[PDB]
Amino acid sequence: QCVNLTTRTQLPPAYTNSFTRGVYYPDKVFRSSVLHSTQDLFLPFFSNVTWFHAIHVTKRFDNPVLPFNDGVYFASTEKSNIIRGWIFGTTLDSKTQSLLIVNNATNVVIKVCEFQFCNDPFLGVYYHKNNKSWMESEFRVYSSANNCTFEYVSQPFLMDLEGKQGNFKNLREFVFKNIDGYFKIYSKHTPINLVRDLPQGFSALEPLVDLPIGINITRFQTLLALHRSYLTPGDSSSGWTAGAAAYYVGYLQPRTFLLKYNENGTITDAVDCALDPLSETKCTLKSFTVEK
Amino acid sequence: KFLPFQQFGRDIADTTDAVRDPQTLEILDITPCSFGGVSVITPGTNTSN
Ligand SMILES: *[C@@H]1O[C@H](CO)[C@@H](O)[C@H](O)[C@H]1NC(C)=O
């Protein structure tokens, strides 16, 4: 049924502050060159988040799960598509449904079914020497799935997959929300190539798809395409082969914020309504500039 | 410039100043008409009407 392949070695988590990222249009309504005050689950300008580095060949194997807790602000800078998708469910079994999203060069598939989850799920990709290409043939992640509910397939939305050698020169920022039985989805793409981790720029996220799914969710996890390694019987290696990747996660919170537009109509600046006394004042009076 | 992921538009006062058709995407602004109040400039009644 399932095979337990766990490593006794463990590593403590690592934290990282959110420089300025996290802002969007709280409602699909449009405005321009005016300042408004709203109230929705946003990302405080100066908030602390956590990083995740799962790269095992020094060597380290750590692919844990992250509880949902009323919305998630996701991101990453993958290049070889190490992260394929994720699943949901409180019990991680066939008793509950799940959402599966796989994107490739052919189409994008978003399957919502009750897939069986193994102890240590992980994707597997082989390499055909005759074809001189890498594909997938091992799909033992889920024992079986039944009670199909939703299934969406379409062309790759925003996946370029053009550059044959991209060394961390892209940034992906989305946001997943669940309220009133609706598991809303967003999509935002700002290309970046800097030696540092986070930039000093500004932008906002946009909705991607509205998939109404009603089910209690408090813990989700992703999957990784462990590539196949050709090893002779006399090698007796660790048996684990994977690439390099590290995704970025955040957190949502309800609070009042003030977003500022421009002549074009795109947000350019904003100030938190409860960050510090100075910002409180900018919300209170009308705007950003305050005289003595 | 309307980003093609918003739905409505409201400048201020809950004024839904963005009306768009499902087939075609167009932005618009709504404001109350010019309108005017009136006042009568009357000399003495006994003088003239
Ligand atoms: C208005 O004109 C009438 C004439 O019929 C006169 O009796 C009256 O005193 C006048 N009133 C004033 C305020 O001039």
Swiss-Prot record, chain A:
Disulfide bonds: 2-118, 113-148, 273-283
Outcome (variant: residue 234 to V): In strain: Omicron/XBB.1.5, Omicron/EG.5.1
Domain BetaCoV S1-NTD: 1-285
Name by which UniProt lists this protein: Spike protein S1
Domain of life per record: Viruses
Impact reported for residue 204 to V: In strain: 20A.EU1
Gene name tied to this protein: S
Entry-listed glycosylation sites: 4, 48, 104, 131, 147, 216, 264
Protein's organism: Severe acute respiratory syndrome coronavirus 2 (2019-nCoV)
Outcome (variant: residue 124 to D): In strain: Kappa/B.1.617.1, Omicron/BA.2, Omicron/BA.2.12.1, Omicron/BA.2.75, Omicron/BA.4, Omicron/BA.5, Omicron/BQ.1.1, Omicron/XBB.1.5, Omicron/EG.5.1
Region (Disordered): 54-62, 124-146, 155-167, 228-244
Role of this protein: Attaches the virion to the cell membrane by interacting with host receptor, initiating the infection. The major receptor is host ACE2. When S2/S2' has been cleaved, binding to the receptor triggers direct fusion at the cell membrane. When S2/S2' has not been cleaved, binding to the receptor results in internalization of the virus by endocytosis using host TFRC and GRM2 and leading to fusion of the virion membrane with the host endosomal membrane. Alternatively, may use NRP1/NRP2 and integrin as entry receptors.
Subunit structure as annotated in this protein's UniProt entry: Binds to host ACE2. RBD also interacts with the N-linked glycan on 'Asn-90' of ACE2. Cleavage of S generates a polybasic C-terminal sequence on S1 that binds to host Neuropilin-1 (NRP1) and Neuropilin-2 (NRP2) receptors. Interacts with host integrin alpha-5/beta-1 (ITGA5:ITGB1) and with ACE2 in complex with integrin alpha-5/beta-1 (ITGA5:ITGB1). May interact via cytoplasmic c-terminus with M protein. May interact (via N-terminus) with host bilirubin and biliverdin, thereby preventing antibody binding to the SARS-CoV-2 spike NTD via an allosteric mechanism.
